[PDB]
Amino acid sequence: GLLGLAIFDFSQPFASYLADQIIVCAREHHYGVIINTYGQNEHGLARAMRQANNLAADGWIVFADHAMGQKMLDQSYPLVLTGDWDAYGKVDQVTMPNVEAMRYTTNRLLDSGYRSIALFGADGSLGARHYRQATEGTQELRVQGYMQAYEEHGIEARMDMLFSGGLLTSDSGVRATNLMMDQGVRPDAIICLNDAMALGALHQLQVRGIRVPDDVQVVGFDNVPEATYANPSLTTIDPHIDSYARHAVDMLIERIQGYDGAKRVYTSDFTLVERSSTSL
Amino acid sequence: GLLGLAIFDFSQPFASYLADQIIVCAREHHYGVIINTYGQNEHGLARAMRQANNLAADGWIVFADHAMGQKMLDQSYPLVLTGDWDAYGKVDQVTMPNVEAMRYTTNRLLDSGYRSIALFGADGSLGARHYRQATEGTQELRVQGYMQAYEEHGIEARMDMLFSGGLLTSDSGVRATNLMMDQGVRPDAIICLNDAMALGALHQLQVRGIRVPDDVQVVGFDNVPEATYANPSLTTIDPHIDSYARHAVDMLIERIQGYDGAKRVYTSDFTLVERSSTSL
């Protein structure tokens, strides 16, 4: 048996980590894995879904990174969606506990006395209503959870405390740090929407004279291997990538083998893994 | 057109970085890329070479991580070898300047007054003759260059100054740091055979109270993106992965399109990129 994985590119550590876990899980089922990337083409994801028709894999896991209209997920091969975008029940999908993990973690920071929390990885200019009402999106749902924690504490979350470097990379984490510091903002804590951004932020904060955690608490999201070896080691939301991969692979193989139940949504659990970049 | 890339797994940053560069290069030629991994199978590389017969790619770049007898590289599809192992002229191959870059860098350390240099990522118990006489191997040729720099300075390199954590990962860099420190060794400098090991070493040195660079100079190899964001930022040998990928892709596409000259060996150039983890 042969499974396909479609991802944008390998530029950030999470793609490597997810792919490796899918490969391990797939091997437990005696399936191989081939990887197609789609970030190198305009309308790239659609082209990869078409290319899958002529590849050898028996079915596909697709990690989407943007919204799709309620057609692309209508394919003739077995297909499981991963990522934070809605499949509208066209296929099984696996996702992370984006709202809950961010609400929990922002609440922990607030309850530990860190009242001013910047968020790296989202555009505040999209407005509070967009985030409050969102039903899909990586950035959107993670912001939503952060906003809910503020609301639970009787405080309005401020769009001016969201900083975006553009993409979700270490270089964007550096850019978001500069944007925030250049605006004179010196917060109690920063939550980054992935570990790549947090690793960039740890670097640029230290370069510009800010001590972590003594001046600013820093939290990431994913618990990629890199987070263990950072200096200081990185506190991060672990969305249980082992279980996430296991569900994606089990669901896809079930469909390849004829499983015909209604399409499902699985949401992984999470753990806040505390390391040296916070002092909660 | 469709190119295949076979690599062991994505567990360390270099595999991501090389794959992404191959994808960019391939896209410039209007070729896609599919990735097969082989580390998840016993005799894995041989199985991937066989699987390639039934995949859709028009030709393969294979990144080998161990020696092959002077049969595996005899295939019916176009094939270019990458990595530090000998193809014996069966196929075109692209490699890094393993001896020269390590000799240059070890000489820079010695000439700057850092006389005691540990090497992380090789087994000293293999003996000096094995390293002096080697004609292939990542570990072997990099050690060979380090030994030549010592010899140029009239000093015998010591096998007891090589530390291996097993594999070439960040976790092995942590293990090699513990092995070295537990033996009471406090060197002037450490050269790690890849950046993943150096990033682990930067972490474990700091955890155990060793300042980089004030107590120990630290150098890596690859100049993966991570090295820019380390704390302290990582001095590293850059083996010109852009040119390495460009040559692998150009050679493979040439063979797919009928190029019939003798098989070639390309060796990339190198630059020592100095950052905060050294003070040369």
UniProtKB/TrEMBL annotation, chains A, B:
Molecular function in Gene Ontology: DNA-binding transcription factor activity; transcription cis-regulatory region binding
Swiss-Prot/TrEMBL keywords: DNA-binding, Transcription, Transcription regulation
Keyword Transcription regulation part of the UniProt annotation: yes
Cysteine sulfenic acid (-SOH): residues bearing it: 25
Name used for this protein in its record: LacI-type transcriptional regulator
Organism of provenance: Bifidobacterium animalis subsp. lactis (strain AD011)
